[PDB]
């Protein structure tokens, strides 16, 4: 309705909204505005990625309209407010961000064009042999690299994500004797509707009792003090109150339990039974696998088979494949550096 | 009277002729005494918690034989102080604990009890306590709770003023009003029949409600009417005579009394023929038969043989009946009287309309009547009947209801049960009919006799009782087949309903509001306020214009001047000065007692009902040393009136002239000369003033300022006083006299002043010490001044040399031109502190950390931050400089060459984190005065979070160390004293500290006694003091109670000085307001022959039309006030002797007729006089109380002593042209204020901003950048001009046309200025919303 | 939720030319519909019309 | 209506749709179940209650909810705030390029003008400024312009003057009672936070200077500017289109000064001189004479 501040909206501006605003105000032709609108949607909240170019060209359905037309227009779009916008590959991002250094920057212009244009793939590790490639030495190259490292990446300045999306918790786990104890914190027609409320008010009091109950059984199923969490099956919680698996997983999926470590509520009931006599499921396998891979490789061992042998020494019956596959995942440099 | 101490630093001069008797009271007192009576142990049981415990306990369960009871309450001590609690943001309260005895008994065994057990205490809720000053701190906010004035319980009557039926009548309706429960309202019909309404129900017959009382129709009519008699035996037909019962009638036949005619047919009915038959003894006489035909039978009459059928009741007798009753042999016949002059035949027509007079039919009729549909179950009837009134607790009118119910019906006993009864309602109907009969009048609802005040005691007790009953309906279920776990007063009580109800009240409630913290006098006047609104009544817009008006009983109870001028007008009132309140909740006001024609100094508080009976004199009247009135005819008040009476008639007198006026207005000089409405503004404007850097004492004033200041509790006042040991800006200690002290505590008193602190209105609170050092202080003297206080006076504005005269149109209308001097000298410069908070919390994606370092952010921006990331204390911050930085991680960035490449090049720069930080709001400014940083336990905060830890720890250690230095000095004095008797080493004993290792054994007596006492007391004080430091230390290192979804907390304070500009909104006490039009250079102002320019120039043309002449008299006396200080200035500046200075000040103080202030010098000597004179160098502060104030004559007299012209006008010169103005001009000191309206807060301006999702229009207001409602009248005005393009771009392009706003702005940027109007969103919406009903609306081409 | 208030399909998409079911993500097509759902792309101002 | 911590809460109008859907599904379920006429009867009743409650929460009694209740709102109530289309549409759009400040007096500043606070324009005129900046060539791109007016240095104030020149603004106050209550003026930039309004128009506006506040609006286009010059400028309408008699009439200290200038007085030096032109300024300014008097005989064309 009106005359009050109903949550009508804010109409904030994202990056694509703002870029399109910036396109509205620039001297594009009828067609070039179609290519521009075609590119600004391709852009991402991350900036740099304008995804595939030749799909931008082919998306228009031929009829002339070469590659060069989208290329020029593309450059000009890449030139709008947040300096380096879009482009591709980060290389051209840093070349567009480097396009304006005012040209009055000492030593930076040339060196920066050489480093940023080409050979930047080898600049990851360190200088080393690159120092011999560009003939530079001492701090001449190091100061240019200070500028290159001073650039930042793409957009993510427009952002428009003021919403942190907090957790709000649901049930509090007051820590007891090296464990956890639940408390669960935080005329006649409508009169007959009043009655439904009595039932809703009676169920509202038991809503906390379900959280404290399932929470108590969840604390009894997995040891808190132990590394990760003891392996459990939904059949235990389904054994206690005799509730269906999907229902319990739904309650733990919706609500989020706050313990002293982890905010992480439905992950405390999901585990494997390992299917082995000698033995914390995949939690400690992948967790402690990445932990053992954290301190290792004095220089560049890059050996996942040695880590698989170390896992087999612990009595987990490693397959040298599964263990290495789960260990090398999630950004793990293992086996990649070989 | 030698005054006291700080008072002798500046004495105002008093012009008030009338002596004072009763001292002005505590002012605030009305808050304290309420809540002080709500927290008490009472033996009688009422008055506070005890009453809510006894309102339920003991509980009976369901046929349980076991029960539960409770014994007192007690309390805990509050965990935090008021300042701590205010900082931390925690609500300030204390634990409520109660010992409940449990009695468990055996089943089937009568009176037998198997066991009893009770918990030490059960802890239920925390009740918020009250500060000393009248506020409840709640989540670190002050919040004053407002008193409410509500229609009182008891019996009420109303004429309706016959404004309904259009014929006109008197329709007398009576409503009964309980404290809690249903309402019964008896009314009259246009056809003259009584009706019963229950809780605003459609009318019912009258005799059903009475029929519920087990009264038969015979008992109904016999009980509610006359008895009389009639007798016919063998056609003798002798009826009883009732001459006194009738004032008139028409006689159809000759009436013979004992063989002689008393009144012939058609003879005079006048009192001659009445007393003629009165003085003569006359028995029953015979009358004509035709007269009986109009009479109606009362009691049911049946024949001896047959009792069948006819004539039960309420039937006009017929000639057929005479034969039957005459043949039956009944000698006596009792019939109703019903002769209509005063009396009337009511209640009988109600029986005519009553469908059935049976009890059960009435109970079923009302039972089925309450709820619209209902089956005739018969149980609903028995339930609702006993329930809706006679239940123990269901309907309770309580003590005001019972008392006023007794005095309403004129019952002698003032005590009774809180539930109604048969005879109660019967008597109410009796009085109601009596009002119709002409005997008796109605009650005025506006009368203060009928309107009671409730304060925070009584209301907290209400909600606490509510909350407790909602517990008891639950705890009743533990013994309900909940069986036995024992351990009952632990698990059985749930504290959650009690606590949520109490903190629900104080939190959120119409009558708990944030306190007005700008001004002391704003504080005060908030905390004595009586509102008609809220929970208990007066929904407003529907109230009507009669509760607005001043009624004659508000005389010295509320105030007729102080009231909001806004559309709640007369609704929100303010207590008058000397007003108080009874135990029953009624306003009573003091009076001096006059016996014979001498005025005794005994005072009596009279209530509004008590007051009207008597005669009361006038506040300002004459009098003699003996105490007799000078004038023989004295103007007095009686009842609703006023007029002159004789000397011997009046028994009372008004105490002081301040009685009518409220404290707000009691401050305004010359309030007589002001019109009341204009007085009415200015009283309101002194609230919304704003305290400035240096506080100037008002130079002319009422005398009231000392009370307000020191009562308001914004000043620091010295308890138990003595000489000042140590002084400083933040701290002031008093070494108390040896006289007042608690033995064994010894020690001194410390006072920590509060430095710069946001107020609820984002203004400074600052205390600055008045006292010097090495100065004696008595109890009650002010050590510091709060803001807008000078040496214990209330100083809300500044004095300004004013000139009345138009000046080039710059002061036009109500505007106001000011010398640049004023702006240079920084009066009117006011501080403003603003809070901003940063909180760092746990998300789904993991925890958030604060600072060092951030993605995508320059070193430039980060230069003002710390190692920890909070800004250095002291930084100047503007615009979107980063006050605290903070990082929020995003989801799972893994692989592919570009991601690994950015992570390799830049080191990922913490990768998924974002930029989320505490940047300053755009368009705000100021230095960072303080940072708090509350953390979490076990977060391992380190960094700079520890600086406040060490800081507060050093402050606490330094504050405690003083008592150890003084007590250790005393113990060292005893040890140093005992060593003199024997083995005295003199200096060698002083140069060897630490007991000189006991100085061996000395004598055995000194060995055991001196070593035991010295070592014992030494180790106990050392270990105890170190223990206090360890407990406090454990209190320092910890983290607060806090939400599960928050990790660590930081708050930053900013301060800005704001400088007056031409948006000032300056005012004066007299309802004077304006803006600042211009700031002139100094040479451009008008100046006098000595070259002193006026500060501020104001427009004479204000003053006649508005008729506020306080202004003018203020100026003149102000002029004369400066004059004396100029004499003294010039005198001390010439290094005159003390004697002559003494002579001129003494000669100044003593001027005027009467004036009752006798201060004279020679009592205080040498300095003390030099002191004050230097204290009054800047002007002499003359003080004119409200209606006894200074006369013109005294002002000219005072003014001639200053060699100023008597007329108060002076030649002034133009500043530009140098030319004399023709005609003299009034110049004078008037005392100005700066109001809380500043344009910095006002000027907005937007071009294109954010819109609304639906309707797509710009947002509401500034801060959010509204654009500016262009409303229906504004369109009408354009249409009227016929300018349709301007109107068309308003409607569309610049609000809801989305494509057209874009095209518009793009063409503007390009210089096209063309519209391309489209169709506004909001129309489209409407078309969907009408399509949402089954109506199509489509636009047809 | 599918077939509910608020729902995709009827009432249109949620992101501009990006739609649920993660396919034909942008501007490849003026209209189109997924195989998982009836999502019809074309812009998302359509929550204000449909 | 999204919340503080996330986890969106349902709006007022949604509840009505949820309710109707629940009763529709339950009546359908019991209808396809082939059950007694009593219970499906009560379901027919309940659903008419539900749809009638979603179209108007009035019609009968209670409606509302257990939410703190209040009638809620319905699609009937949903009609434009005041249940007229007052709000939102119909003369009532809230609006753009607008601002508002306190009024002071204008005591130089001729009738057709209006002291507009320097800081406050610069906002109102933003689009206009960027145009000029791009013309002069001080900004090649919109972001450049944008940045220089954000930095608000130097050329920009110089261009502001050039933007404002002859561009009529329009001011409006409070209750607008008659058409005079909004009028149009040539602004003159003035450092300050407040708007200076010429005295003579204070009549019309019914405004004193005790803290009244004015809105300001910017006509764009051309048509609108001309309608402001040739209709709403304060110099078009000096006469009140009710009674017809002039507004603009001098009040308050203007009156007092004319009335003082023209008086007669007895004596008051330099009486009965004969002079021509007069001009007579000579003589008042020089002393020589008293303007209240002399009953000087002067020659006049």
Numbering used by the authors:
A (entry chain M): 106 to 257, 259 to 292, 320 to 396, 398 to 413, 415 to 473
B (entry chain C): 1 to 1341
C (entry chain D): 52 to 101
D (entry chain D): 253 to 553
List passages from the publication reporting this PDB structure.
Gene transcription is a fundamental cellular process carried out by the multi-subunit RNA polymerase (RNAP), which is conserved from bacteria to humans (Cramer, 2002, Werner, 2008). The σ54, which controls stress related genes including those involved in nitrogen fixation, nutrient starvation, infection, and other cellular stresses, forms a class of its own (Buck et al., 2000, Merrick, 1993). σ54 recruits RNAP to its promoter sites via binding to the −12 and −24 consensus promoter sequences and forms a stable RPc that rarely spontaneously isomerizes to RPo. Instead, it requires ATPase activators bound remotely upstream of RPc to convert to RPo (Buck et al., 2000). In order to understand how transcription is initiated and how initial de novo synthesis is carried out, we prepared samples to capture the RPo and the RPitc state by binding σ54 R336A to a promoter (−35 to +28) with a pre-opened transcription bubble (mismatch between −10 and −1 by mutating the non-template [NT] strand) to form RPo and then adding UpG di-nucleotide as well as GTP, to allow de novo synthesis of a −1 UpGGG +3 RNA to form RPitc.
